[model samples]
Target: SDPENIKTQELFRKVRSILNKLTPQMFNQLMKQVSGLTVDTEERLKGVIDLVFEKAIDEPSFSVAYANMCRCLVTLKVPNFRKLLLNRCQKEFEKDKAAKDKARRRSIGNIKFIGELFKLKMLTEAIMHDCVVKLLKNHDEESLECLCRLLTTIGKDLDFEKAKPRMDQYFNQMEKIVKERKTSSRIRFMLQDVIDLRLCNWVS
Candidate 1:
């Protein structure tokens, strides 16, 4: 029984190791092999998705690496892989949203991962806007920080003509927060920077 667990752990380690060093060109070559790795039970597939999600958010620079791999998986037509990853992101967001510990960084990373997915066209604008709206409900320092980071990352694309009204509403809300909320200097300044960036049409 324990040996089976060890084997699974070995599999995770192997995939994790390769993913860490993945590059854009290496992905087309790795797709066929990665298919075999994912061609197992659904539960096992989720485990692999977990690894991808964690790797995507582990650092700012690595987001593209893992995000590209994610799109590649869908391109290869792995059944339900895209949906599974989206569901996983939502679950992780909810969990991180509720935690009281000092895991705000983790939440921000997860949010950044979602932003990267949007950049890759792997997700819709609605899902992203919904996530930001949910974050607005909390409006605490930690959640606002996450919200601000996400907007700054994807704000340019997100502020299209059709989304103008919604984007304006979000910016107005943020301005209100900056003026009225008793947040930390760090968070306040960060939110102000985001607002200013948008006001300047995201130039800077």
Candidate 2:
């Protein structure tokens, strides 16, 4: 079925209108509606995701909206959409880094959003492994920690063969950075821990 084009528009409009009013109850309703949709249509799925993303950004308290987005992605089985959302989130954080207030808020928001998605199983372990690899390449301690925490959850799923080289690169970069400046002990310890956990012994 075409999902009754008229109903689709109406449903989407209603969803948009209530986006800012999201609560646990409302999120459940939104998730139900999203799950009922025919995700076979990639274009439609993308449109739906875009609308949800817009609502998330527009809402005063986007936490629930973000949660709903994660639920929708999980229910829709949209790995690519999840990846796209993660990339957008990273870009937002990067853009805000120079501004103290924006950077703080956005980084917190990104951490919360990613953490929730990981918890909800919207982002698979394999995808998280790739994200960690990218974050390692960037060498942002906070971002790296955020990625690592998620990877730690499904540590057994990590593809050591594929990740070994990137892990080595990340450790090398961390070593060079730490040697040049006396970083906080906590961060230094975390860097060493990641290296040890990834390379010295995967069993850990």
Candidate 3:
């Protein structure tokens, strides 16, 4: 177990090192190795996904960086990498929705990760909108908080022209909540902030 543990540690370190050292310019060259790791074997593939997902959620600041790397990997056609990631996101979203805790840091971070991925054009607008509405329907503090964070990340690039009707209805529902819902002031204010962003043409 000792030798195998060391080997596993080294494997994770290699993935982390590659990601840490990577920049936009280094992408094409580094991704050759990245894809090698991703497509190498089942264990390595799952390990790579685990490390990347952990990085994205744990380090909110680097969510976009990880999302960019995911986009690159998908573009490079690393087998079913995109499909696997999407499935993972879907699972997390569902788990977080009915989560026991009201103040879920993990859930918020994962929501932010999904937001960044959507901003990178990795997720469809339809799925993005559906997630927002799903959070709205939950009508809880954590759900609204997650919804607010997600909108803040993706609002500017949401392509209002393409989603005009749905966007309008979504905003209307949010506005109604702002005016009538008996939720916490903090969550309500955060939701209002996103609505304000939409009103400002998502300047932020």
Candidate 4:
């Protein structure tokens, strides 16, 4: 468990070994224990986080792993991880996590980039959650169609334990708005598609 004591040639191998089956127990007791082992001076644990998130982001297994980290962060008194999410994306600047404004994902609204944030665990794309929830709640025919595809990506790409609990809470809040806009079959179908996937497996 004294990972920091390992030499450079063995560091990557050891790090990969830990990440390959990274567990909260190892991360807390071993991985995170090693100073500069999990993250470096810049706090850009790129390969480390990337290896962890290579699995589908919102998938149950990934979510379990993520929530495990969330729990560990809680013990460290990091309630929301806004402060603990110190890992820089570009690594061009910013040394700590509280460089708040700089933490926003450069591509705020693009669905593809949203997927990148989860798949890479690069940065907290708060706006992404905002964009998706906003569309799901405020519906236009065009908006409904857009959110269907967007939510589809998120449902497929992201799999976290509590992520969808919030997603369901927010997106389900749209049911009223969705029912009001049944003039277009395309819109209705899109809305239902989201339900089947976004909240589907949970139901279906």
Candidate 5:
């Protein structure tokens, strides 16, 4: 049976308005609402997350809304939500990387977005570790820089002793990748600079 059509329309309108007018306070309120609802209806909680994600890209208040959305989604333990967030982040990163101008700015934005994802618990250490390993294997310098920034942020959030293992893995992989490069002096120079900077410690 169809749900009450008028009531559904009214609720939808309300949700839209709330998302449109999203502020930090509003996002916090929505987070509370979603958290409360998750106990009774996980699907409903995810719907709320979807609403937040939809508004986030267009809304100037995206960081707050996205962060809160991630919190609720993580609390729900929904793998699909994590996948979606990661996929969107990767898409944004690729798009920004391909751009001729504003590359640095775009990369920084991607880093900030990833940091927010981590902050909200949407990104796990295991996932980040896997990603770092893969990026090192690929040896994409720009991508490496983008990920280094993210790792630095994660390192700050982690205990130094705990972070050291990941840092060592990153350093070792970077060294291996640099040694394998056949050409691209620019990439070689940049990689050397990265190593010299001891960015692993910088992250700590």
Candidate 6:
């Protein structure tokens, strides 16, 4: 298996090197080649997940198709896959915070692949709430607004009800911003969209 192993290693490297450059059309040809590898060991599984996540966070031109390639994890199903993603998100989350602080007006596609996993029921509320909400809370007006919009779409199934007072606190912050007349109408409207989400149970 020595020659075969080296051939496979070369295949993975070539595929990963092209991942960030993958297009809507060229996705499956490369994906099928990678998925055909024998993933009998944790080391092998992690190798695949590492290669896949290298492309997951960036706002690639064919993002949907690119993410779809990684979604095959739902079927391949590595126990460490979610753990690997969380680790990767830890990195992306840090970069997002730094970008937010530096940009006079900034937006980066936060760890959105996590949201994709949520929609797939692969990630839980508690994990997301603690990790993602903190990032949202720490971000500035523009960053929060952009990430919140992405969350609204990708996080609909995530249990905001479980997060309670923190979500309420975040809502309160958004409510405060929306009510301020000096805030741009665009920002207010964007912020209000998130504020309008029913993050918890309410009464008449």
Q: Candidate 6 — what's its lDDT?
A: 0.56
Candidate 3 residue lDDT tens string, 1-204 = 687667667778877876665343244665666655534444555677777887776676667677777766564443276567777778776665553553355655676777778777677676687677777776777788777877787765564687877778877888788888688888778988998888888785
Measured against the true structure, the TM-scores of the candidates, in listed sequence, are: 0.68, 0.56, 0.65, 0.39, 0.51, 0.69
lDDT of 2 by residue, 1-204 (tens): 465676667656655555545353456677766655555455556656666655555542555466755576555553276665665555554554435534544444455455456566665554454455545545455655655564455454554667666556656776675665555677667666765675646566
- Off-target runs (Cα >4 Å) in candidate 5 are 4-13, 21-40, 54-61, 69-114, 134-142, 156-167, 176-204
Give the per-residue Cα lDDT of candidate 4 at 19.
40
Clash count per candidate: 0, 0, 0, 5, 0, 0
Pairs clashing within candidate 6: none
Query: Model 5: per-residue lDDT, tens digit, 1-204?
Result: 255444444544555665565345445576665544322243443455555555555442366555765665565553266766666556654554444434444444444545676677786665455445545544455666655555545544552577777777777776766687763666666656656656545432
Candidate 4: 10-residue stretch with minimal lDDT:
89-98
* Highest lDDT against the true fold, candidate: 1
Worst 10 residues of 3 by lDDT: 21-30
For 1-204, candidate 1 gives per-residue lDDT tens digits of 687677677768767876767453355656765665543446556777788887776674677667766766665343376678778877876675554534655655666777788888877787798778867767777789879878888888888999999999998988888888678878989999998898898999
RMSD of 2: 5.9
lDDT assessment of candidate 3:
0.70
Off by over 4 Å in 4: 1-112, 115-120, 125-127, 156-159, 202-204
Against the unseen true structure, what C-alpha lDDT does each candidate score?
Answer: 0.74, 0.56, 0.70, 0.46, 0.56, 0.56
Native-vs-model 1 lDDT?
Answer: 0.74
For candidate 5, the 10 contiguous residues with the lowest summed lDDT are 36-45
> In terms of lDDT, which candidate is stronger, 3 or 6?
3
* Candidate 6, poorest ten consecutive residues by summed lDDT: 102-111
